[PDB]
Amino acid sequence: CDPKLAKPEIKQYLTKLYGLELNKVNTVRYTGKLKNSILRKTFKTKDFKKVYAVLKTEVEPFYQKIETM
Amino acid sequence: MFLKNYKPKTPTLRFKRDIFKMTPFIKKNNIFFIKNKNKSGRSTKGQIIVRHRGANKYNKHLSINVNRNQLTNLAIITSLNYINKNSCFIGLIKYSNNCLSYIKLANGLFIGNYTKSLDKPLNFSFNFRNILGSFIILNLAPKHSIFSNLISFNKKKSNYAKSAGTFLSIIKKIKEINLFILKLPTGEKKYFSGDSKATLGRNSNFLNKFTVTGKAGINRNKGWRSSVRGVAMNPVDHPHGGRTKTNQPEMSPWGWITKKNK
Amino acid sequence: SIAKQEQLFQNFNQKDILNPHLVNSVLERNIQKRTERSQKGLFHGKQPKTGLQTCFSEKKSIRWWKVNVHEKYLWSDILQKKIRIQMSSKTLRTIDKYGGFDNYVLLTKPKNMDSLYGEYLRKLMMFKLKDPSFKIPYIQKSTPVKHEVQRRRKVFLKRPIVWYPKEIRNTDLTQLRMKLPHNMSRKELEDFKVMEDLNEHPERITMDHPIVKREYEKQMQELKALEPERQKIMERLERYRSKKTLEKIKEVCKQGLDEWENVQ
Amino acid sequence: AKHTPNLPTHDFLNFKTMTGNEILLNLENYENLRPSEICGALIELSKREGHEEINWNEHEWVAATTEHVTKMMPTYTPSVVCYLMVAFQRLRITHEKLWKNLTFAIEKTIHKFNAKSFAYTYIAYLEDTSRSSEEFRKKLVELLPIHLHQMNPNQLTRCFELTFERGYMNEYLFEQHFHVLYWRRNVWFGVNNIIKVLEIYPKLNFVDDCDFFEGAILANIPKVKTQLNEQ
Amino acid sequence: KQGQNSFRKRLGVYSYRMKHSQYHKKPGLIDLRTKEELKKQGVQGRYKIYRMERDSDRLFGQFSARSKFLFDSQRVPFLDIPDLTDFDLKPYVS
RNA sequence: CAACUAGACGGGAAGACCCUAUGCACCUUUACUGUUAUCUGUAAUUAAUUUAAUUACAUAUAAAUAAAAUAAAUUUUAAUUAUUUUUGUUAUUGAA
RNA sequence: CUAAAUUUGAUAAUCUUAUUUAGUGUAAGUCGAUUUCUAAGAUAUAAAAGUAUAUUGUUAUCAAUGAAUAUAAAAUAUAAAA
RNA sequence: UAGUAAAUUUCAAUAAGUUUUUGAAAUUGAAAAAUAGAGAUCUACCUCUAAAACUUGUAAAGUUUAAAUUCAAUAGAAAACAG
Ligand SMILES: [Mg+2]
Ligand SMILES: [Mg+2]
Ligand SMILES: [Mg+2]
Ligand SMILES: [Mg+2]
Ligand SMILES: [Mg+2]
Ligand SMILES: [Mg+2]
Ligand SMILES: [Mg+2]
Ligand SMILES: [Mg+2]
Ligand SMILES: [Mg+2]
Ligand SMILES: [Mg+2]
Ligand SMILES: [Mg+2]
Ligand SMILES: [Mg+2]
Ligand SMILES: [Mg+2]
Ligand SMILES: [Mg+2]
Ligand SMILES: [Mg+2]
Ligand SMILES: [Mg+2]
Ligand SMILES: [Mg+2]
Ligand SMILES: [Mg+2]
Ligand SMILES: [Mg+2]
Ligand SMILES: [Mg+2]
Ligand SMILES: [Mg+2]
Ligand SMILES: [Mg+2]
Ligand SMILES: [Mg+2]
Ligand SMILES: [Mg+2]
Ligand SMILES: [Mg+2]
Ligand SMILES: [Mg+2]
Ligand SMILES: [Mg+2]
Ligand SMILES: [Mg+2]
Ligand SMILES: [Mg+2]
Ligand SMILES: [Mg+2]
Ligand SMILES: [Mg+2]
Ligand SMILES: [Mg+2]
Ligand SMILES: [Mg+2]
Ligand SMILES: [Mg+2]
Ligand SMILES: [Mg+2]
Ligand SMILES: [Mg+2]
């Protein structure tokens, strides 16, 4: 997500648009970490927010993780 | 209300003498009690303006009826409490309407005694035939008497004799113009009016004069820090400073003469 | 309009000259050469100055001249209010010329009267003429502010002088306070002379009298309301374990009652 | 912009300059305004020209304004109640449910009123015998001398007449409290308030054992003459 | 690590995690970097911060005198998203 | 190479004490000149009458004794008694 | 924490709180804060004063190191408790 | 442009450390062109002038461009991406 968002906006954003039933919604915020370019000038990355959407239904693990490799 | 001569079990208890502060008879309340910031001799801008002053373990405030005009019922005394800055006792006072307050007590009182305020002459207190420690008008008083907390007719608060063991003896009485001539603790004289008001009898703790601290830590725990001579000090810091401990004239650090005729 | 003090109030309305927050924006500013007091008052263009004091050996040092000031309250016949005013001795010299104060504010040019406060009063004094239905409840900087108590004693107000119980806090406790003669009623003045005479002749005091019969009933009711609190006290001393400390105090408290008996 | 006016934080509304019409628009939004804001809206209508010719009992929003108060009256602070009373007093308003919930909102708060705020009750409830019972009025008389001595002069003589015409006046109140003030504190009242006195003392079967007509009043009038007009 | 030092004073407070747990007051209503500058502006910065917290959209319900919070769904923004079933258009034109 | 330290007027601070410079700093005082606190006469603010007091004007507090302003009640908030203050401020004289 | 590499880690290094590159990871109706209350204090600040621009700041906002609290919610008045 | 002009004590800026003038602080305060003021203290004679307002756009640091005067990487700027 964009970290400006909030849960009750996320809730109706999904149920209206993708139309999937949910029991619970969670939220976690992260800060973009600092790194170094090739020429060794610093630059900060972007801040982002994570959402752990809990559902009623079953899910296939193709969306839950990456393939077994 | 009595002195304690201590047995010299230490160096500081050899000469010490202090008063029984009567903790069993002090039922403490949260009705009249504030503890303010301790002012260590400083302004609001933090600068010291009066020296030799600091922390006080015995800081408090207890609100008192110096002026007891507002009620005339008879009263008793339930308890007591001690004040530090003047080393005076006080006592609660329960009026017949179950009211409550603190007062300045006089010497010779204690729990169980009665006290009131008086609008009218003395024969018309059928209760409280004894008269000590009562709020009374100066005209409505005997020939001989002594007053301890005076409230002049042109005034709200009291400004004289508020300390321990003090009083104001009478020299004259002029009922014509209603003008009395009272003596102060120093000896000076002042015109007062018989429409004014005061208490009867000396204030509590006549016996502070017969006291010995005996320990520096009894003053440190009041807000009295350590003084320093002007002679140990360097010449920058004090106008006596130097190696000579003799000095014409004898001065103050801001610059002015302390000892006159001298 | 060449006066900088006129440009500021220039575009104000009959409705914006009342907003006190906005006027204070204009009176609490700083002008180029004029002081910050000289706009709070009506000096007639006068300001202090500096210069060089001298000596015998011709040394020199900064010295400050200053301007006379005459703090004063004046009444404006138009506005029907009093106004504080600081002013020089040239204003007094002139107010008598133009006649009254409401003509000084209202005939001078702002170039000579270099105050802002003198032009704020001017415009409040023209609108009142152009509309006598103009309500001016409060004039700005008209009078100072007086508090009740100092800043130190703001704390001690918190706790009550006498605590009254719930049944009694709001009743008429008025006959109970101690009564000086000028405060007290007609009947009580007459009763006082009766009380004033029998003090000298207590043989005449009996319960067969209205006043004494009136009082003795009252006072004995007060005593009877205290005996419960008395009994609660004497129990405390009774169940108190140490008696030497008690007998010690009674030796002291007697020393006070003896003095009071034999005063001299 | 330089030199801004340094205005406070509070978002309240100053009606004190607004025209009367500009007040009524903001009274449309009565459900949302704060109770301290209504007080400043209604009292000022009294100060605007043309409030006598109107009957505000029939005006739409002023009517609904009351019906919002009568619900939320006991929620309000004790100061506020004295601010409404005067406003509905000054606006000539009659609403039975209004004058019930005020009175029960005042028996609560009678102990937190300033003297000046005890007066505006003592007039409003005695200037009309219909706004309450007599039991409530008898309480007010039993509470008057608490606040009497400290009130304005113009605020006493209005409280001194409303006793006599209603008949609650006793010897206790007259000889202890009232007569002492006029007999000692005599011209402090002023000229417009002594006129009313001299029409009442004769009605009272009064004696003049005092010598205050000459010595207290008449001897002390010419110390005030600035107050005197042709009327 | 190298070259991170002076770059990190300059950011200052780029996140809510940094200071002690009792430092950030009314966090989400205003972005930190606009709040941390105003607090260096002294007095009017405080007043300006208070006026924005008052008039902030992202307060989805009033506070309480207690630790509990009041949630009003009417302050929540609304979305006009319709149903897309039986919708023939598609995001690319032939 | 291990080891020692007699000497390289041995290495480390353009070193310690002493003298000069028409150099500096801080401190002292009956060193020179001076500033200020502070004391003082006249004048302004300040008016009338009487023979220096009295009154008048004015400021404030108190006596159960008006307030006002700061969002929320519209008309000099001027009575009396006692006491306080101009032992002031500004220009000026001389001293300090 | 995981994977890969060896460049000033007081040696070496397949190792990593030397260094380099990338990726993963902190789930809250309650806890801990925010919020309410207030202390010391801060303050180009309301009103108002002082004054040379030589300054103040009884309001208001901010400010624990303190006090109380989870399930219906807000408020006036009173009393008691923590 | 009447509490103005001007005057007495002091200071300031006027080349002048002193004797003006122009202005300010304090104190006083005028006339009516027949009047008033300056002319290095005062007097006389004469001469000159009339003590109201307004009016000269581009000043300044910063960026960029064109040109002249200059340096060519221990120079030029602190910096040939560096506040
Ligand atoms: Mg979370
Ligand atoms: Mg100091
Ligand atoms: Mg000392
Ligand atoms: Mg010593
Ligand atoms: Mg020494
Ligand atoms: Mg020194
Ligand atoms: Mg010295
Ligand atoms: Mg020796
Ligand atoms: Mg201001
Ligand atoms: Mg002054
Ligand atoms: Mg931490
Ligand atoms: Mg919690
Ligand atoms: Mg060796
Ligand atoms: Mg050597
Ligand atoms: Mg030489
Ligand atoms: Mg108002
Ligand atoms: Mg003098
Ligand atoms: Mg002088
Ligand atoms: Mg591994
Ligand atoms: Mg290595
Ligand atoms: Mg390997
Ligand atoms: Mg390592
Ligand atoms: Mg590790
Ligand atoms: Mg906090
Ligand atoms: Mg804490
Ligand atoms: Mg010169
Ligand atoms: Mg020169
Ligand atoms: Mg001159
Ligand atoms: Mg001139
Ligand atoms: Mg000239
Ligand atoms: Mg000349
Ligand atoms: Mg010549
Ligand atoms: Mg010009
Ligand atoms: Mg090269
Ligand atoms: Mg090179
Ligand atoms: Mg270079």
E47 vs D11: CB contact, 8 Å cut-off?
Answer: no
Q: What one-letter code names the amino acid at D133?
A: S
**Experimentally determined by:** cryo-EM
Partner residue opposite D146 with nearest CB, options C133, C172, C182? C172
Q: Which of C250, C260, C261 to mutate to test the interface with B (most CBs of B within 10 A)?
A: C260
The SS3 of residue C252 is: helix
- Backbone φ, ψ for residue A39 (5° rounding): -75, 5
State the alpha helices, DSSP H only, in chain C.
4-10, 20-27, 89-98, 104-107, 117-130, 186-198, 210-224, 227-239, 244-261
Q: For chain C, what's the residue count?
A: 264
- In this complex, the answer to whether residue A45 has its CB under 7 A from any atom of chain G, a nucleic strand, is no
Q: What one-letter code names the amino acid at B62?
A: L
Residue with tokens 């409550």: B100
- Positive or negative CA dihedral for E83, E85, E87, E91? positive
Residue of C nearest to D107 (CA): C170
DSSP D48-63: STTSSS--TTTSHHHH
Own/partner contacts of C130-138, CB < 8 Å, gap of 24 or more, are: C131/C14, C133/D49, C134/C14, C135/D47, C136/C18, C136/C79, C136/C81, C137/D16, C138/C20
**Contact by Cβ (8 Å): B149, B203:** yes
* Distances in whole angstroms, Cα of residue B93 to Cα of each of B106, D135, D193: 13, 36, 44
User: Considering only residues 180-209 of protein chain C, which place a Cβ less than 7 A from any atom of strand F?
Assistant: 180, 182-184
Neighbours of ion ligand 4 (CB under 5 A): B 227, 229
- Within 8 A of C12 by CB-CB distance, chain D residues are none
For E60, what's the count of Cα atoms within 13 Å in the CB-facing half-sphere? Answer: 12
C18 vs D210: CB contact, 8 Å cut-off?
Answer: no
The SS3 of residue C81 is: strand
Q: What is the largest CA-CA distance in chain B?
A: 73
CA distance D178 to D159: 10
* Region of residue B255 (left: phi > 0; alpha: psi -120 to 50; beta: else): left
**Contact by Cβ (8 Å): D80, D39:** yes
The SS3 of residue D12 is: coil
Written as six digits, the tokens of A14 are 């999904």
Which of chain G's bases lie under 7 Å from a protein CB? 18-23, 25-36, 39-54, 57-65, 68-70, 73-79
**Contact by Cβ (8 Å): D76, D34:** no
- In this complex, the answer to whether residue C106 has its CB under 7 A from any atom of chain F, a nucleic strand, is no
* Region of residue B98 (left: phi > 0; alpha: psi -120 to 50; beta: else): left
Partner residue opposite C257 with nearest CB, options B75, B108, B118? B108
- In this complex, the answer to whether residue C66 has its CB under 7 A from any atom of chain F, a nucleic strand, is yes
CA distance D41 to D83: 11
Axis-axis angle for helices D20-27, D60-72 (nearest 10): 50
- Backbone φ, ψ for residue B190 (5° rounding): -145, 140
A31 vs E17: CB contact, 8 Å cut-off?
Answer: yes
- Backbone φ, ψ for residue D164 (5° rounding): -70, -45
Partner residue opposite A12 with nearest CB, options E8, E11, E79? E79
- In this complex, the answer to whether residue C146 has its CB under 7 A from any atom of chain G, a nucleic strand, is no
Beta strand B179-183 with B168-174 is: antiparallel
**Among candidates B131, B109, B107, B105, which has minimal Cα distance to B120?**
B131
Q: Does D175 touch chain C (CB under 8 A)?
A: yes
**Among candidates B233, B238, B234, B231, which has minimal Cα distance to B255?**
B238
**Among candidates B197, B180, B206, which has minimal Cα distance to B65?**
B197
Please list the residues that pair with B115 across neighbouring strands.
Answer: B75
- In this complex, the answer to whether residue C47 has its CB under 7 A from any atom of chain H, a nucleic strand, is yes
Query: Which residue's CA shows the smallest distance to C1' of H81?
Result: A41
Measured between alpha carbons, how far apart are the two ends of chain B, in Å? 41
Instruction: Report how far Cα D42 is from the mean position of its chain's Cα atoms.
Output: 15
Q: What one-letter code names the amino acid at D176?
A: Q
- In this complex, the answer to whether residue C70 has its CB under 7 A from any atom of chain H, a nucleic strand, is no
**Contact by Cβ (8 Å): B163, B203:** yes
Q: CA of C45 and C1' of H60: distance in angstroms?
A: 33
- Within 8 A of D9 by CB-CB distance, chain E residues are 47, 50-51
C25 vs D5: CB contact, 8 Å cut-off?
Answer: yes
The SS3 of residue B23 is: helix
For B147, what's the count of Cα atoms within 13 Å in the CB-facing half-sphere? Answer: 31
In B221-258, which positions are buried (b, 16+ CB within 10 angstroms) versus exposed (e)? ebbbeeeeebeeeeeeebbbbeeeeeeeeebeeeeeee
Q: Does C13 touch chain B (CB under 8 A)?
A: no
**Contact by Cβ (8 Å): C91, C104:** yes
**Contact by Cβ (8 Å): D145, D163:** no
Binding-site positions of C: 28, 71
**Among candidates C121, B177, A6, which has minimal Cα distance to E73?**
A6
Which of chain H's bases lie under 7 Å from a protein CB? 1-4, 10-12, 24-29, 53-54, 82
Whole-number CA gyration radius for chain C? 35
Chains C and B touch (3+ CB pairs under 8 A): yes
A6 vs E79: CB contact, 8 Å cut-off?
Answer: no
Residues 6+ apart with CB under 8 A from D167: none
**Contact by Cβ (8 Å): B94, B100:** yes
CA distance C178 to B73: 10
Element (H, E) at E46: helix E44-54
Partner residue opposite C195 with nearest CB, options B24, B72, B120? B120
CA distance B61 to C155: 10
**Contact by Cβ (8 Å): B64, B182:** no
* Distances in whole angstroms, Cα of residue B5 to Cα of each of B14, B204, D50: 8, 20, 86
Q: Does D190 touch chain C (CB under 8 A)?
A: no
| Resolution of the structure in the document, Å | 3.7
Q: What one-letter code names the amino acid at B100?
A: L
Neighbors of chain A with 3 or more C-beta pairs under 8 Å: E
Measured between alpha carbons, how far apart are the two ends of chain E, in Å? 53
Element (H, E) at D106: helix D96-109
Measured between alpha carbons, how far apart are the two ends of chain D, in Å? 54
The closest ligand to the CA of D5 turns out to be 9
**Among candidates D143, D125, D127, which has minimal Cα distance to D81?**
D125
- Positive or negative CA dihedral for C138, C143, C149, C151? positive
Residues 6+ apart with CB under 8 A from C18: C136, D16, D17
DSSP D40-101: HHHHHHHHSTTSSS--TTTSHHHHHHHHHHHHHSTTS-HHHHHHHHHHHHHTT---HHHHHH
- Between the CA of C102 and the centroid of ligand 33 the distance, in Å, is 30
- Positive or negative CA dihedral for B244, B248, B250, B254? negative
Written as six digits, the tokens of B10 are 């230490």
Residues 6+ apart with CB under 8 A from B177: none
Residue with tokens 């509590």: B204
CA distance D78 to D75: 9
Q: Does D9 touch chain E (CB under 8 A)?
A: yes
Cis peptide before D35 (omega within 30 of 0): no
Q: CA of A19 and C1' of F15: distance in angstroms?
A: 91
Neighbors of chain D with 3 or more C-beta pairs under 8 Å: C, E
- The whole-angstrom distance between B74's CA and the closest CA on chain C is 6
- Between the CA of A38 and the centroid of ligand 34 the distance, in Å, is 28
E81 vs A17: CB contact, 8 Å cut-off?
Answer: yes
CA distance B173 to B194: 9
**Contact by Cβ (8 Å): D44, D37:** no
Please list the residues that pair with A28 across neighbouring strands.
Answer: A50
- In this complex, the answer to whether residue C51 has its CB under 7 A from any atom of chain H, a nucleic strand, is yes
Q: CA of C222 and C1' of G19: distance in angstroms?
A: 93
- Backbone φ, ψ for residue D2 (5° rounding): -90, 160
Residue of D nearest to E48 (CA): D9
Written as six digits, the tokens of B249 are 């004239």
CB pairs under 8 A between D and E: 4
- Between the CA of B54 and the centroid of ligand 14 the distance, in Å, is 57
User: Considering only residues 162-181 of protein chain C, which place a Cβ less than 7 A from any atom of strand G?
Assistant: 166
Neighbors of chain C with 3 or more C-beta pairs under 8 Å: B, D
- Between the CA of C138 and the centroid of ligand 16 the distance, in Å, is 9
**Contact by Cβ (8 Å): D142, D150:** no
CA distance D221 to D102: 42
CA distance D61 to D26: 10
Instruction: Report how far Cα C255 is from the mean position of its chain's Cα atoms.
Output: 46
Q: What one-letter code names the amino acid at A34?
A: L
- Positive or negative CA dihedral for D158, D161, D166, D168? positive
- In this complex, the answer to whether residue D43 has its CB under 7 A from any atom of chain F, a nucleic strand, is yes
Instruction: Report how far Cα C144 is from the mean position of its chain's Cα atoms.
Output: 11
Burial of D219 (0-12, 13-18, 19+ CB in 10 A): middle
In B120-135, which positions are buried (b, 16+ CB within 10 angstroms) versus exposed (e)? bbeebbebbeebbbbb
* Distances in whole angstroms, Cα of residue E59 to Cα of each of C31, C194, E34, E50, E65: 45, 77, 18, 13, 16
Axis-axis angle for helices D35-47, D78-90 (nearest 10): 30
Beta strand B81-83 with B75-76 is: unpaired
E3 vs A41: CB contact, 8 Å cut-off?
Answer: yes
A42 vs E4: CB contact, 8 Å cut-off?
Answer: yes
Instruction: Report how far Cα E7 is from the mean position of its chain's Cα atoms.
Output: 24
Q: What is the 3-state secondary structure (H, E, C) of A1-69?
A: CCCCCCHHHHHHHHHHHCCCCEEEECCEEECCCEEECCCCCEEECCCEEECCEEECCCCCHHHHCCCCC
Residue with tokens 């002053």: B53
Burial of C136 (0-12, 13-18, 19+ CB in 10 A): middle
B153 nearest nt, CA–C1' = F63
CA distance B76 to C192: 27
State the alpha helices, DSSP H only, in chain B.
217-220
3-state helix, strand, coil in chain B (%, to 5): 5, 25, 70
C67 nearest nt, CA–C1' = F90
**Contact by Cβ (8 Å): E58, E75:** no
Instruction: Report how far Cα C221 is from the mean position of its chain's Cα atoms.
Output: 42
Residues 6+ apart with CB under 8 A from B35: B59, B60, B61
Element (H, E) at B172: strand B168-174
CA distance B144 to B141: 8
Q: Give the DSSP letter of residue B48.
A: B
CA distance C85 to C42: 7
Residues 6+ apart with CB under 8 A from C99: none
Please list the residues that pair with A32 across neighbouring strands.
Answer: none
- Between the CA of A40 and the centroid of ligand 35 the distance, in Å, is 22
- Between the CA of C79 and the centroid of ligand 13 the distance, in Å, is 104
Written as six digits, the tokens of B146 are 């002594």
CA distance A31 to C252: 78
CA distance B106 to B162: 11
Q: Give the DSSP letter of residue D176.
A: I
Q: Does D146 touch chain C (CB under 8 A)?
A: yes
CA distance D51 to D89: 12
CA distance C93 to C95: 6
